[PDB]
């Protein structure tokens, strides 16, 4: 608990460091990231911190309440998403994000998770058809990391 | 917590893959590690999760309850002791340790932290002096990964 931090890495040139600080009942999630394609990418936390297939391995996203995927914002909401990061620049940008919802709490504590940061934007709470409805059309992740304690 | 990996990384060429079972009051660690020497092979949980700037950023040897540096088997050593690690002829190391101590549990838990290897023995804090008492002496790292939650 309190304080965690994750090193976002992959075989392209995406890389971001994010770290997590729990400010009571909510998580203050910031980071840069870096080597990408400029917009809004699917930003995300998956299940597992699983490496042994790269970002595969990682798995779904973080539902322990069994729903669906939407935006940081829905209620209608999978634990893991907290939606889209901005690229501009270089390709880089923007990590600040504070949620009610994740945590590292346990039953619902996000490490020893992945954080990935996936390669197309997240239709977020509405949109597509079936993958949006839990996934979020975002696609090839590029970098993931395992969110490990810090302090 | 009921399962976790560890993907032993490091900056040589030593790797390896160890595994965590949470099957009693007691955790099974499993694995297999190439890259080493010969020899023992000091085998820590590091207190902390990122190499956000190597295996350095990890820390010291998980001690939560300020006690002294030793061996798996000792009353008085840190919840990160593990001992050593021997290696072959070339290669490989076989681990299969299973340890009263840790878990994924909470608390004393290890999931988010680091796994980590080093140059040269453990000699289980007593053999020699000041710094024994500490990090055992089993020396220096080059392999480790963050400890994370498994399917
Ligand atoms: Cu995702
Ligand atoms: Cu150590
Ligand atoms: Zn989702
Ligand atoms: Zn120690």
Redesign the interface.
């Given at each position: 608990a309190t304080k965690?931090?994750?090193?976002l890495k992959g075989d392209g040139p995406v890389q971001g460091?994010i770290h997590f600080e729990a400010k009571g009942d909510t998580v203050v999630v910031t980071g840069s990231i870096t080597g990408l394609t400029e917009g809004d990418h699917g930003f995300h936390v998956h299940?597992?911190?699983?490496?042994?297939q790269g970002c595969t391995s990682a798995?779904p996203h973080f539902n322990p309440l069994s729903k669906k995927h939407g935006g940081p914002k829905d209620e209608e909401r999978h634990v893991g998403d907290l939606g889209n990061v901005t690229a501009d620049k270089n390709g880089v940008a923007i990590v600040d994000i504070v949620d009610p919802l994740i945590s590292?709490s346990?039953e619902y504590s996000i490490?020893?998770?992945?954080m990935v940061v996936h390669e197309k934007p997240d239709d977020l709470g509405r949109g597509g058809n079936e993958e949006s409805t839990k996934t979020g059309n975002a696609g090839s992740r590029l970098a993931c990391?395992?969110?490990?304690?810090?302090?």
């Open positions: 965690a931090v994750c090193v460091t299940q597992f911190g699983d490496n042994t798995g590292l346990g490490i020893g998770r992945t990391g395992v969110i490990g304690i810090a302090k």
